[PDB]
Symmetry: D2
Subunit: 115 residues, 4 copies
């Protein structure tokens, strides 16, 4: 259910493989200059009462072409069924000096679908 290609509504696309050990690994494409490594974890033996599957991943925004000095972690759940969704909240953290530490983190949410 998780393994595959997921789209948000801003044109972003990620491809993930959900491993039996509970590993999540893939590529987030914000172009080869826009592709980044993702890595995370998921609940590999979820409850079967209609609850969703807890998961999370991280992208550090560096590849072989560019570097944003920042990272995004998404925390959320997979909802199967009808048309599957991954509903998430995210944190974006940027490298800053001590003095700008207070404005280092952005918070948001994102929903991914299989189409």
């Amino acid at each position: 259910g998780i393994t595959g290609t997921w789209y948000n509504q801003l044109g972003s696309t990620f491809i993930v493989t959900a491993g039996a050990d509970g590993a999540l690994t893939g590529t987030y494409e914000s172009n080869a200059e826009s592709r980044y490594v993702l890595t995370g974890r998921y609940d590999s033996a979820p409850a079967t009462d209609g609850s969703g599957t807890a998961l999370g991943w991280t992208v550090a925004w560096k590849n072989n072409y560019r570097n944003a000095h920042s990272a995004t972690t998404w925390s959320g759940q997979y909802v199967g069924g009808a048309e599957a969704r991954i509903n998430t909240q995210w944190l974006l953290t940027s490298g800053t000096t001590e003095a700008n530490a207070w404005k280092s983190t952005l918070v948001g949410h994102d929903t991914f679908t299989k189409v």
Copy 2:
């Protein structure tokens, strides 16, 4: 610098290895029954201006003894200096039904040190 053993106020311990091209691997404990796998990423080429090093990691709270059907993601930055510390904000998502999604996700923060 990142590589090593870290602690938080509440006495949890996390062991990381920072890979030369941005990977993070390790364990998070709070005894082996409290040991879980972490995985994440970091900026392997941070600014030279005194800024910190962005990073993130995830833990799914399942091991071979336990499953709380939830996962936590930490987004933050490593600050090398007088005292090396990792300053984070985090998100804990639980698997919930669609009716309870609204109360699925906790938010907090955590400071890690090597001491």
Copy 3:
């Protein structure tokens, strides 16, 4: 056009008046949680926003205590109003329950709400 009656995706109703001094005053009625009947709200908004088509920053608070019950908790919504055809307010919110020191790590929930003047 912030003043008025607003609905979120889960059918909660927010009745608010935007005054001249940047004040936000009203009532909230939730469709979920340890809740029943109206709760008092107060907040602030930017009463002289930019012209560039940026939205209007705003915020408000509800403590979940009325004459019928007390959930020992408060939510704050932080967001922006976007005017026009289908007007709307997009928010991220934080819900803090009172806890003892030991349980404080789990005292805050975070979430996102979207309000529209039409009920879903």
Copy 4:
């Protein structure tokens, strides 16, 4: 416990009156130029178990002299006694265009004391 002047480590100062209704009213100072109105709510009947006292408040960052086109909300709790403190998580949202909303909200924490 709550009415009076509170200070963060940042320097910022906030003076509040907690009314019997559960109203919070006051000013947030960082000179007139840096003074802003705050309004909020608190639980005027907290449990007795030793649970802190839930509150929140908002400041829109406009006064007669400047306008940042932004608003911050603090969600947190009051913990009384000698080292009485208010612990909060905050959100700061900036008015942005639709294209830019994904980066409109910052998150962080702050701790307020009486000294």
